[PDB]
Amino acid sequence: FGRFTERAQKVLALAQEEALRLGHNNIGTEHILLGLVREGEGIAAKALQALGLGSEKIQKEVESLIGRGQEMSQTIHYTPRAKKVIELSMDEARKLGHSYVGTEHILLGLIREGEGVAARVLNNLGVSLNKARQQVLQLLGSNETGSSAAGTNSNANTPTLDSLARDLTAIAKEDSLDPVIGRSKEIQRVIEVLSRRTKNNPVLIGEPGVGKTAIAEGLAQQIINNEVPEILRDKRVMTLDMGTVVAGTKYRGEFEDRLKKVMDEIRQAGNIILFIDALHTLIGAGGAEGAIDASNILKPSLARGELQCIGATTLDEYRKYIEKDAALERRFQPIQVDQPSVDESIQILQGLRDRYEAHHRVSITDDAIEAAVKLSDRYISDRFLPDKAIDLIDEAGSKVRLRSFTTPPNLKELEQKLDEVRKEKDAAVQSQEFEKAASLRDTEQRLREQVEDTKKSWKEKQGQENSEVTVDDIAMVVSSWTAQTETDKLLNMENILHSRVIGQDEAVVAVAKAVRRARAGLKDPKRPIGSFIFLGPTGVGKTELARALAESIFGDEESMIRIDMSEYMEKHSTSRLVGSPPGYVGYDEGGQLTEKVRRKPYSVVLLDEIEKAHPDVFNILLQVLEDGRLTDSKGRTVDFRNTILIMTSNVGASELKRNKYVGFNVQDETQNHKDMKDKVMGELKRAFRPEFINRIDEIIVFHSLEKKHLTEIVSLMSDQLTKRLKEQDLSIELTDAAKAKVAEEGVDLEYGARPLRRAIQKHVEDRLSEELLRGNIHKGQHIVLDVEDGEFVVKTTA
Amino acid sequence: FGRFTERAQKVLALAQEEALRLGHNNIGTEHILLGLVREGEGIAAKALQALGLGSEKIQKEVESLIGRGQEMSQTIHYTPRAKKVIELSMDEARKLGHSYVGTEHILLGLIREGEGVAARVLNNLGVSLNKARQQVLQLLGSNETGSSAAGTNSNANTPTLDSLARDLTAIAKEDSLDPVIGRSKEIQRVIEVLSRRTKNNPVLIGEPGVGKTAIAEGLAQQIINNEVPEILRDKRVMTLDMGTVVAGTKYRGEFEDRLKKVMDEIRQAGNIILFIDALHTLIGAGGAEGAIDASNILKPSLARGELQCIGATTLDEYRKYIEKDAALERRFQPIQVDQPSVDESIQILQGLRDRYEAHHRVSITDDAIEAAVKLSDRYISDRFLPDKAIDLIDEAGSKVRLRSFTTPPNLKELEQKLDEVRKEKDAAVQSQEFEKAASLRDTEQRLREQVEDTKKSWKEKQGQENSEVTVDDIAMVVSSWTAQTETDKLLNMENILHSRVIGQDEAVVAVAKAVRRARAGLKDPKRPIGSFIFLGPTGVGKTELARALAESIFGDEESMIRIDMSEYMEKHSTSRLVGSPPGYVGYDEGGQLTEKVRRKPYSVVLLDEIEKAHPDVFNILLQVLEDGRLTDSKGRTVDFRNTILIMTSNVGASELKRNKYVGFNVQDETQNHKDMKDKVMGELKRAFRPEFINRIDEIIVFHSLEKKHLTEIVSLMSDQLTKRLKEQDLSIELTDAAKAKVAEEGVDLEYGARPLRRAIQKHVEDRLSEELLRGNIHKGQHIVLDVEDGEFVVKTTA
C-alpha cells in the first residue's frame, strides 16, 4: 500500500531497470524475480543467493523468454503477474505484523505467485520454487525493535508463573512495556495500600471507561526503578488474567479448581503482588445474582495477605462488598481513578498519534489533540476525558483522510471519460469491428495513465491530512457525534444560539455567555456547564434555547433530556383503586432522570415545572446542579458533569402570553411586548425555593406571545410538515409569504390559533401534493412556496 | 421450462430425425441416446464417445429394435419414455444450479431413465448405465457465468476467516458480488465513524425492513477499489454470521467459548473491520431477560479499537445499550439508515425487477412497480413502505403466471371430454367389448392432441407476463392482501367512503380528499397520512366512515383500530369494562394505545373521545400526529406512519342524535339535517384542548337519527344478519321492501330504533330458516327478501 522498508522498494525498482535491459516490454514476474536477485543480499535477494542465483543468471533466463528486443519497453510498468507478486509481499508482512513491508515478503510472494516467467526462471536455474520460499522465511522480517534483555532463568517462579499468567515486570526488562501515561497520580496512591499487607488491597474506583488499566503498567515500571521500598523489593507483580482461565474451560468447577491452584501457588506470600482485574466478579457477593464465588478461598487469603492483590472496580460495584465488612473491607482502602485531570488526557493523545499514522491522517496536530480533550470535555461528556478525546483524533484522523482520496484535483472527469472508452471499445469488438475497437482500445490506456497520474496528484491531498488531524477537523468530528468548529461553536455560542431562538434575547445571551465561559476554559468536570432557570410563558423561548444548545453547543445535532415533575405525584393503597406509576421524583431518582442522563451524560437536562412540585424535590435536583452527579438507581453515578441543567418555570405564563392587541392604541401592542419582557424576571422569585435557585445560575428570560408570535408558530408548523417531506426526498421551503396565506385562514378571536396547522396543511401539504402530481414542480428540487400578489404562488428552483 | 442452451435442444431434435431414419416413427429413448452422440462431442455426446459409442453404434441397436420400416411417420412425436428423459434433465441441471439446461444434463437424464428404449440400447451396446452418467457429470459447461481467479494464497489471515464466517471481498475479487441497490447514501456516512481506531464503530439505525443489509456490500466495493484512506487501505473486512456460531452448539457455554476464539482472532487489530448484524443480542445489557453477554470481552475490544465494527440495529433496539455506556459511547456513534419513503421504495423495486424476472412476470411493468410502492403505503400499510412494495410486484409476479397455466381459451371443456372417453373405452374393454372400446380409444387421442394444442395456446399468457407484472395485477395482489384496482380504490376513495356512510357527505369528502392526495406519496411517511376529527353524536356516521376509510385507503374494512381515550383517564367502569386501568395516561403511552397500533400500522386508528380524557392523553395523541412514531412500552417503536389517526367527539350529540318530529313541518328531518351540518363545527371547539387537535388534516361532519337515518340503520343491521349466514353458503339479498316490513315493528316513539335487530331476526333470520325448512329456498340459491303487497314475499334467483 505505502508502508515498506528500503530493501523491498529497492528490489522493485531494479525490475524496471532490467525490463528495458532485456527488452521485456511490460514486466511481469520475470523482472520482479530478477529484481530480487539484483538487489544482492537483502533478505529476498540473499535468499536467492543462498540457493545459488546471480543477478546475471536471472536476467539471462528472463531474457531467454521475453527476450530481445522490446528494449524501450514502452511505458515501462508492470503487468498483472508482477502486480500479483507485490500484493502478496504486503500480506507476507501482515503475517508478521510488520508495518513497513520488507524484501523477504517479496520473494515469499513470488513463490506464492508461482507462475509467469519468474516462477519457471527459478525452477530453471537449479532452485526449486519452494526452496526459495524456505530461505526467505527462515530469515523473515526486521522492521521493529528487538529485545533489550536476553538470557533464560527460573527459581521460585516455577510453580506459580507457569499456569497462568503474564508478568508485567518481565516484558519491561525487555522494554516492550509502555509507562502508561494514565492516571499517573493514581499509581502513587496504591503504594500505601500495597506495601501494606494488612489493607493488602488497593482498590481502584472510577469510570470504566477511563483506561484504569494504564495505572497497572505504572506499577511494572516503578517496582523496577527506583522509589520501590525494601518491601516491594524482592517482589514480583504478576497479573492474573481472566482470559487464560476461561480458555479451554466451559464449566464453573474447572474455573474454581484453577483458582484453588492460584491460592496454593500464592505461597510466595508477603513477597508476591497479584493483579486482579474486575475484582467484583470473583467475590460474587450482593446483588440478585452472583457471578461465581471465589470468595470462599479468596476472603481468608485477603485477610492473611497471602493474596496481597490489586482490585479494579468501577463507580457502582464497590457498595456490595464494603457492606460485607470486614473481609473485603479488611483488605480494601480506597483511591480515586474517577475521571483523570485534563492534562493527563492530553498526554495519552500525543502518545498514540503515530499509530493513527498507521491508521493515517494523524500523527498530530498538537492543537487538535489538546482540543480532542478540551472540546470533548464539555462536548460529550459521555465518558471520562481521554476516551472522548482519542475518538476525535482518529475520527478526524480519517474524515479528512477520506477527502484525501476521493478525486484527482478536479480531474475526476478523466475517470468519467475512461469509463465511456472501455464501453465503446468493448462493444465495438463484441460486434468486431476489430480495428473499430482498436483505436478505442488505444484511447483507453492513453486516458488511463493520465487518470492514474492525477489520482496520485491527490497525494497532495494526502500531504494535507497524513500528519495533521486539524483543529477544525477534530472539532467537526466531535460535532459529528455531538479546536475550531467546537470552539467556534463555543466562542460564537451567543451568535449561533440567537439564530435558533427568535426574539427573547434576554434569555439567550444569558445562557450563551455563561455556558460559553464554562465551555471555553475549564469550569472543570463536576457541575453542569450551566444551571439555569428558564422563565417565560408556557409557550415561546424556553425549550428552543435548551434545544439550540444541543444542536451547536453540544456539537451538531441532538442532546437534550426533559422530565416534567408535574406528571405524577401519587402513591399508596390499602384497598384503593390507585396503582399508578411512582410519584414523579421517586420515579426519577429510582430510575428515570438518573438513567437517562447516565445513558447520554451530555444532554441539556430540562427539569420542568418544579414550581408545581414540593420543595423537597428541589433539594434532589439541587444535587444535580451542584455536584454534577446524582447517585441513585442502585448506586450508579450519573454524569451531569458538563450537561446543561435548565430548570424551567412558567409560573404566571398568561401575562407573558399577552398578544399584540390594541388596548388604548396600537401602542398597547408594543406594550404587550415591552411589558412582558419585564414581567419574566418576577416569575423567577415565584418559581422555586431560593435554596434551589442558589445552585442555579443565570436568569433566563422569555416573554410575550404577540402577533408576531402567531406567524412565528406558523413557521414551526410548516417546517414540521416540510421536514417529514424532506424525509420523502422533497425539498420545500416556505417564504414568510406562504405562511402569510396560512394566517389568512387562521385568525378569529374565538377560534384561537387552532386553524394554523390545518391551513398549513391546506396551503403547503395539500398544495404541494397538488403541484407535484401535476408536474409543475418535482421532488428533490427546491420548491418555494410564496404569496406574491396577495394569493399563493408556486416557484421552482434547483 | 423456458431456458435451455443450444447443445441440449440440438441433442433433442436429432433424436426425432434419427428415430424415423431407422424406422421408428415413434421416437423412443433409443433415438434420444442416438441423439446425444449424434450431436457429436457436446458433453452428452462426448460422454457416450468416451464409453466407446458413436451415433452409428446407437442407431444399429435402434435398427435392431423396431428397425426398417416405420419411416411412414406417426406425425413423429415422443414416447412417454422420451418425455421422462426431458423431465429428468431439468433436475439434472437444477442440481448443478443451472436453470438453462445443457448437454450433460440430457445424457444424465437418459441414465436417470435407466429402464427404457435408450437405457437398453446403451446397456446392449456394452457400456454401463452409470459409466455414461459419470462421463456427463465430469465435464460441465453451461452451468457457469464467468468469474475470475488464477491462484490463491494466504498468510496470518488463515485461522480467523476459516472459523466463521467468510468475507465479502473474496467473492468481489471474483467480481460476482452484487451492488446492492440500497441505501447508497448510507454507506458514505460510515467512513469518518469507522476509519477511526477509537470510537470506530458505526451503528446503523433504520427499519430492518428497509434493506439495511444493502449498505454492507457497499463497504466491500469501496474499500477494495480504489480511492479510500491509507487507513482503510491495509485493512480486511470480515463478516461474522450468527448461524455458524449456533451450528455445532446447543448450549450457552459452548457459544461463549467460540466467541472467545473470535475475540482472540481480533488480533488483526486496528486494521480489521468486523461486521456484526443484529449487534444488540451480543451486548446483552438491558431488557427484562437480556441476552447472552459477550460484552465483557467485546466492550474493551471496541474501546481498544481492535474491534472496529459495524452494528445493525433498528428503530427501537438501540436505547438499552447506549444506556450501558461509556466505552459503549466511545465505540458507537450513530448514522441514519433509510426511513421508509416512497421515492426510495421505487428504486429498490426497479433494482429487483430483473431478479424477480426469475418469475417471468415482474421485471416491470413500470406503472406496476410505482403502484406497488404508492399502493402499498395505503393498502397495507403494516410493513415498511419499500418492503410492502416489492412484495406486491413479486406477489403479482406469480399471480398472472397462475392464470397462465390453467387456460385453454375456453377449450377447458376439451380436457373434461377427453377424460370421459377413457372411461367408456376402459369399462367397455373390461367387459371386452374389444372394438366397443376401440372406437372410444381412437376418439380419445383425436381429442387429446386438440386439448394439448389449445393448452399450449397459453404461451400467450407467457407473452403477457415475461416482463410485465401487470399494473392491474399489482393492484389485484394488494387487494388480495386487503395500480388499477387499488389506485382506483385510491382515486375513487371518496366514492368508496361515500358508499357506506349514507348522508354526511360533508364528512366523506373531507377524509377522502386528504388521504387520497396524501397517499400518492406526496405527504409525509412518518405521521398518519390523514389525521381527522370525527364529530357527531355517539355513532351515526362517525365510526362507519373510519370503516369505509379502511376499505378505501387500505383495501378492506379490516384496517381499523379503535381505542377509547376515556379509558385513559378512567373514572367510569373498573369491573364492568376493562381489566386493570389505573395509571391511566401511563397505561395508554406505556402500553395499550401504542401496543395496538404496533400490531397494525395498517389501520385507521380511531382514538375516540379525546375530549373526555386526561389532558396528558391529548399530548400523547399529539406525538402520534407529529412524529408518526412513539417509542414506549419496553422501548418499542410503533409506526403510525401509514395509519389514519382519527380523534372522535360527541359533545354536541343531542341535535346530532335528534329525531324528526312534525310540529309544523314535514321538512323536519331535513331541518334535523340543516342543524347538524352546523353542530359539528361547534362541537369541535367545545370538545377539545387546542394543542392536540390542530394537527388534524380535516374536520369530519356527521348527522343524527332524524326520520331518515333510522330506515338506513335497519339496512345496516339486516346486512349483519345475512352475512354471518353466508359462511354456511346461504346466498341472501334483501330488497328495501323487506327492510320495510321489519321497520313496521320498530318506529315506536318511546322504545327507540333499538327493536329493529329483533324484528330483523323475526322477518329475515327466522324467515330464511323457515323457508329453508320447507324447502322453498336453498343454499347457493340467491334468496330475495321482499315485500310486494304490504306483506313479505320470498323469491329465488341464481
**Which H or E run contains B336?**
strand B334-336
Question: For residue A745, which phi and psi values (nearest 5 degrees)?
Answer: -140, 70
Question: From CA B744, how far away is CA B752, in angstroms rounded?
Answer: 13
Query: Does residue B543 contact residue B516 with C-beta atoms inside 8 Å?
Result: no
Contacts of A455 in chain B (CB under 8 A): 226-227
By what method was this entry solved? cryo-EM
Chains A & B: contacts with CB separation below 8 Å: 240
Q: Which long-range contacts (CB under 8 A, 24 or more apart) does A414-423 make?
A: A414/A447, A414/A450, A414/A451, A414/A454, A415/A451, A415/A455, A417/A447, A418/A444, A418/A447, A418/A448, A418/A451, A421/A447
Q: Give residue A116's region: left, alpha or beta (phi > 0; psi -120 to 50).
A: left
Cα dihedral A424→A426→A432→A435 (10° resolution) = 70
Query: Does residue A571 contact residue A586 with C-beta atoms inside 8 Å?
Result: yes
The grid cell for A758 is 390545518
Angle at A337 between CA A335 and CA A340, to 5 degrees: 135
Of all residues in chain A, the one with the smallest CA distance to B157 is A95
SS (H, E, C) A578-607: CCCCCCHHHHHHHCHHHHHHHHCCCCEEEE
Contact yes or no for A401 and B153 at CB 8 A: no
Query: Does residue A26 contact residue A76 with C-beta atoms inside 8 Å?
Result: yes
The residues near A776 (Cβ < 8 Å, ≥ 6 apart) are: A794, A796
Query: Does residue A483 contact residue A374 with C-beta atoms inside 8 Å?
Result: yes
The residues near A399 (Cβ < 8 Å, ≥ 6 apart) are: A361, A473, A476, A477, A480, B191, B192, B195
Q: Which of B198, B228, B526 sits opposite A727 (nearest CB)?
A: B526
Contact yes or no for B231 and A1 at CB 8 A: no
Strand ranges (E), A589-705: 604-608, 629-632, 636-639, 644-648, 699-700
Say which DSSP state A433 is in. Answer: -
Question: From CA B592, how far away is CA B597, in angstroms rounded?
Answer: 9
The grid cell for B486 is 387499488
> Three-state DSSP class for A276?
strand
Contact yes or no for A766 and B156 at CB 8 A: no
Query: Does residue A267 contact residue A259 with C-beta atoms inside 8 Å?
Result: no
Contact yes or no for A359 and B260 at CB 8 A: no
> Three-state DSSP class for A224?
helix
Q: Could you tell me the resolution of this structure in angstroms?
A: 9.0
Q: Please name which of B109, B115, B90 lies closest in space to residue B36, comparing C-alpha atoms.
A: B109
Burial string for B219-239 (b: 16+ CB within 10 Å, else e) reads bbbbbbeebbbbbbbbbbbbb
Only one residue has cell 373498573, namely B574
Query: Does residue A391 contact residue B198 with C-beta atoms inside 8 Å?
Result: yes
Q: Please name which of A139, A137, A118 lies closest in space to residue A127, comparing C-alpha atoms.
A: A118
Pairing of strands B731-734, B563-564: unpaired
DSSP A299-364: HHHHHHTSS-EEEE--TTTTHHHHTTTTTSTTT--EEE-SS--HHHHHHHHHHTSTTSSSSSS-S-
Alpha helices in B338-483 (DSSP H): 342-351, 366-378, 387-404, 412-431, 435-455, 460-465, 471-481
Binding residues of B for ATP: 206-213, 536-543
Of all residues in chain B, the one with the smallest CA distance to A380 is B329
The residues near A728 (Cβ < 8 Å, ≥ 6 apart) are: A779, B341, B342, B343, B521, B524, B525
The grid cell for A5 is 522498508
Pairing of strands A644-648, A530-534: parallel
Breaks (C-N over 2.5 A) in chain A follow: 482
Instruction: Please tell me the distance in Å from B333's CA to the nearest CA on chain A.
Output: 6
Say which DSSP state A716 is in. Answer: H
Say which DSSP state B26 is in. Answer: S
Query: Does residue B509 contact residue B622 with C-beta atoms inside 8 Å?
Result: no
Question: For residue B133, which phi and psi values (nearest 5 degrees)?
Answer: -65, -30
Contacts of A728 in chain B (CB under 8 A): 341-343, 521, 524-525
Pairing of strands A636-639, A629-632: antiparallel
**Which H or E run contains B784?**
strand B782-787
Say how far residue A405 (Cα) sits from the centre of its chain: 22
| Angle of the A80-94 helix axis to the A29-38 helix axis, nearest 10 | 50
Contact yes or no for A91 and B322 at CB 8 A: no
Query: Does residue A1 contact residue A90 with C-beta atoms inside 8 Å?
Result: yes
Question: From CA B88, how far away is CA B95, in angstroms rounded?
Answer: 11
SS (H, E, C) B266-323: HHHCCCEEEEEECCHHHHCCCCCCCCCCCHHHHHHHHHHCCCEEEEEEECCCCHHHHC
The grid cell for B233 is 487501505
DSSP A724-746: HHHTTT-EEEE-HHHHHHHHTTS
CA terminus-to-terminus distance, chain B: 42
Starting at the edge strand that comes first in sequence, how are the strands of the sheet with B272-277 ordered? Answer: B236-240, B272-277, B308-314, B203-206, B334-336
C-alpha radius of gyration, chain A, whole number? 36
Q: Please name which of A342, A339, A352 lies closest in space to residue A374, comparing C-alpha atoms.
A: A342
DSSP A139-164: T----S---S------STHHHHHHSS
Query: Does residue A410 contact residue A484 with C-beta atoms inside 8 Å?
Result: no
Only one residue has cell 538470557, namely A151
Question: From CA A767, how far away is CA A797, in angstroms rounded?
Answer: 17
Instruction: Please tell me the distance in Å from A569's CA to the nearest CA on chain B.
Output: 11
Question: From CA B380, how far away is CA B475, in angstroms rounded?
Answer: 12
The grid cell for B728 is 354456511
Within 10 A of A131 (CB to CB), how many other CB atoms are there?
15
> Three-state DSSP class for B484?
helix
Pairing of strands B203-206, B308-314: parallel
Question: From CA B599, how far away is CA B611, in angstroms rounded?
Answer: 25
Query: Does residue B482 contact residue B602 with C-beta atoms inside 8 Å?
Result: yes
Of all residues in chain B, the one with the smallest CA distance to A80 is B150
**Which H or E run contains B608?**
strand B604-608
What is the tally of helices (H) and strands (E) in chain B?
Answer: 38, 15
Question: From CA B414, how far away is CA B406, in angstroms rounded?
Answer: 13
Only one residue has cell 399471480, namely B399
Classify residue A741 by burial, with Cβ atoms within 10 Å: 0-12, 13-18, 19+: buried
Q: Please name which of B334, B312, B339, B333 lies closest in space to residue B207, comparing C-alpha atoms.
A: B339
Q: Please name which of A523, A526, A534 lies closest in space to residue A562, comparing C-alpha atoms.
A: A534
Angle at B233 between CA B228 and CA B236, to 5 degrees: 120
Pairing of strands A334-336, A309-312: unpaired
Instruction: Please tell me the distance in Å from A751's CA to the nearest CA on chain B.
Output: 7
Question: From CA B158, how far away is CA B677, in angstroms rounded?
Answer: 79
Q: Cis ω on the peptide bond leading into residue A355 (within 30° of 0)? A: no
The residues near B74 (Cβ < 8 Å, ≥ 6 apart) are: B25, B26
What is the tally of helices (H) and strands (E) in chain A?
Answer: 38, 15
Which amino acid is present at A192? Answer: E
> Three-state DSSP class for B79?
coil
CA terminus-to-terminus distance, chain A: 41
> Three-state DSSP class for B405?
coil
The grid cell for B346 is 421505487
Instruction: Please tell me the distance in Å from B338's CA to the nearest CA on chain A.
Output: 9
